[PDB]
Structure formats: structure tokens, C-alpha cells
Design a protein around this ligand. Structure first.
Ligand code: CA
Ligand code: CA
Ligand code: CA
Length: 316
């Protein structure tokens, strides 16, 4: 029932052709006017960016994204190109690159499958097939293994129980099962808790989590936590956090993408872009309350140049 707000809204008055002309002017000739590019791309929403891309190609017979890639470099390029990616294909594309090539980007698989709604997951699967002529499930199963793979496959079904009647007996039963699983460090008969966390309704699991706290004295996350956690544990954590609050999950994700030396820029960019028109405002709020600091301040200290300027404009 929760209603969320993003930080990027449709620009007005909108003129796709004028914006396309401005972007071309900013790139034509040696060098680049990065300032104009970031000001336009961060202030026009995703749908508007697609209209600008179409106008750009009609006026010049050039591809806006290809030109941005040739003109820009580093993190700034990645951010601008990610902003340009159609909202409808963003996740399919992210998942494709998370599984393509050597190794697997478990973080991306986990982040997306744990936080997307059933409707969003259904779109992802259809788009993946349409765009890449491949079955997403088969691709994921081929690049992942074990319990981690199975929980991902469960989430991929986008078939979690719908919110409905409260089942007190089941809440207690599930809480008892998870308590015992937690005491066993989530390494015994994993199938049982994968069914519970992957398929029970969001409303039911929130009740189960509260009961779990009463039984153990700890919140379920506290028993699954720790750096020395495996892929399954990280997915369990993401699922639990998203069941509670997707915005809080992303606030924490942003926090850890910047806490400590260096930056997980791929994650910072991915989250800022993907959530910009959904719940980034709520994310900002959760960030400030849960970390005693503003997202704006953390970004300002961790980034620089046009990349930073664009990120801050997105943050709003
Ligand atoms: Ca140029
Ligand atoms: Ca791979
Ligand atoms: Ca840092």
C-alpha cells in the first residue's frame, strides 16, 4: 500500500528537438561540453530522454547513445549512458551483463530479484526474451549454482503469495522454522526456509519477522549478517530487507557503496538511475534516518567532477 516518490520528474516545457539540437551542439567538433549534456539528461525523465534520442536520430541520422559513448569517458560516461537506457530494458540489460562472460555478478542478480515487484519481474523476463532471444531463467541457472540458484529461480517466478488473510498458526509455524534455521547458521535443510522467504506473502513475512524477533531476541537480519557470508546469505538478507522496506534496502546499499576507501561506482550509478523515478526520495529519507547523514553529503565526499555534479542533480 506504501506510496513512494522518485527525485526525477518530467521537464517542462519539453521540446525534444531543441534538446536534441543542444546535445548535438555540445558534442559536435573537438572536445565536449559535458555541462550541457548532464544538465539536460539529469533534468529530463527517462521517457523524455527516449524522445530526445528519436529526435536526435531524425535530425542528424546519428545515434545519441553511440555519440555519448564516443564523446565521454569513465564514470561520467557510464552514468549518462545508464540514464539514457530505456526504463523497460534497464534490468534485462543489467542481468545480461551480470551473467555474460567469465564469473558472475551475484550482487546485481541479488539486488534486482530481491527488490523488484512481481510485475517488474514479469516484464524483465519478457523483455529479456524479446531483446536477447534467450530465456532468462535458463541463463541464470547456467551461471549460478546450488541453493543460491534455487532461491533466484523462485524469485524469478514472480509468484509470491498475494497479500491476503492473516494466518496466525502459519505465522507461528514459519517463525519457529526460521528460528531453528537461524540457529543452524542457515546451513541446514535450506529448501525449507527458501520456500518460506521466497513464496510467503509480504504481509505474512512481516508478521513472521516480528514473531521471530520475539522468539530469539534478535531480528532475522542479525542472524544472517556478517561479512563472511556466502551468496545465499546475501540473497536472504536482500530478500528480508526488501520485504520490510525496499527504500531502506537501497539506502543501505548506497551507504555501503560509498563507506570506506574508494567507491563501488557501478552500484552507486545503478541504484541512483534505476530508482530515480520510483523511490529515490524515500531512499534519501531512509538514508538520513538510518545513517545519521545525508545521501547528498556522502556522494559529494565520494565523487568528483561532472560525475559528481550529475549525481547530485539526480539526488536533488
Ligand atoms: Ca566532440
Ligand atoms: Ca558468467
Ligand atoms: Ca568512499
Amino acid at each position: 500500500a506504501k506510496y513512494t516518490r522518485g527525485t526525477v520528474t518530467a521537464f517542462s516545457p519539453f521540446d525534444a528537438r531543441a534538446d536534441a539540437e543542444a546535445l548535438r551542439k555540445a558534442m559536435k567538433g573537438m572536445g565536449t561540453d559535458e555541462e550541457t549534456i548532464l544538465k539536460i539528461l539529469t533534468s529530463r525523465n527517462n521517457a523524455q530522454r527516449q524522445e530526445i534520442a528519436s529526435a536526435f536520430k531524425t535530425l542528424f541520422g546519428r545515434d545519441l547513445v553511440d555519440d555519448l559513448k564516443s564523446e565521454l569517458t569513465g564514470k561520467f560516461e557510464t552514468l549518462m549512458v545508464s540514464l539514457m537506457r530505456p526504463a523497460r530494458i534497464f534490468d534485462a540489460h543489467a542481468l545480461k551483463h551480470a551473467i555474460k562472460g567469465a564469473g558472475t555478478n551475484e550482487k546485481v542478480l541479488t539486488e534486482i530479484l530481491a527488490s523488484r515487484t512481481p510485475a517488474e519481474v514479469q516484464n524483465i523476463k519478457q523483455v529479456y526474451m524479446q531483446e536477447y532471444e534467450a530465456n532468462l531463467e535458463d541463463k541464470i541457472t547456467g551461471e549460478t549454482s546450488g541453493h543460491f540458484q534455487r532461491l533466484l529461480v523462485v524469485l524469478l517466478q514472480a509468484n509470491r503469495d498475494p497479500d491476503g488473510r492473516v494466518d496466525e498458526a502459519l505465522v507461528e509455524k514459519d517463525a519457529q522454522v526460521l528460528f531453528r534455521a537461524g540457529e543452524l547458521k542457515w546451513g541446514t535443510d535450506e529448501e525449507t526456509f527458501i520456500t518460506i522467504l521466497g513464496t510467503r506473502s509480504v504481509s505474512h513475512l512481516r508478521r513472521v519477522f516480528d514473531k521471530y524477533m520475539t522468539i530469539s531476541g534478535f531480528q532475522i537480519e542479525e542472524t544472517i549478517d556478517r561479512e563472511t557470508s556466502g551468496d545465499l546469505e546475501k540473497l536472504l538478507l536482500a530478500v528480508v530487507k526488501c520485504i520490510r522496506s525496499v527504500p531502506a534496502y537501497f539506502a543501505e546499499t548506497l551507504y555501503y557503496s560509498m563507506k570506506g576507501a574508494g567507491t563501488d561506482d557501478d552500484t552507486l550509478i545503478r541504484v541512483m538511475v534505476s530508482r530515480s523515478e520510483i523511490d529515490l526520495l524515500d531512499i534519501r529519507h531512509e538514508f538520513r534516518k538510518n545513517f545519521a547523514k545525508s545521501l547528498y553529503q556522502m556522494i559529494q565526499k565520494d565523487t568528483s567532477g561532472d560525475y559528481r555534479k550529475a549525481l547530485l542533480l539526480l539526488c536533488g
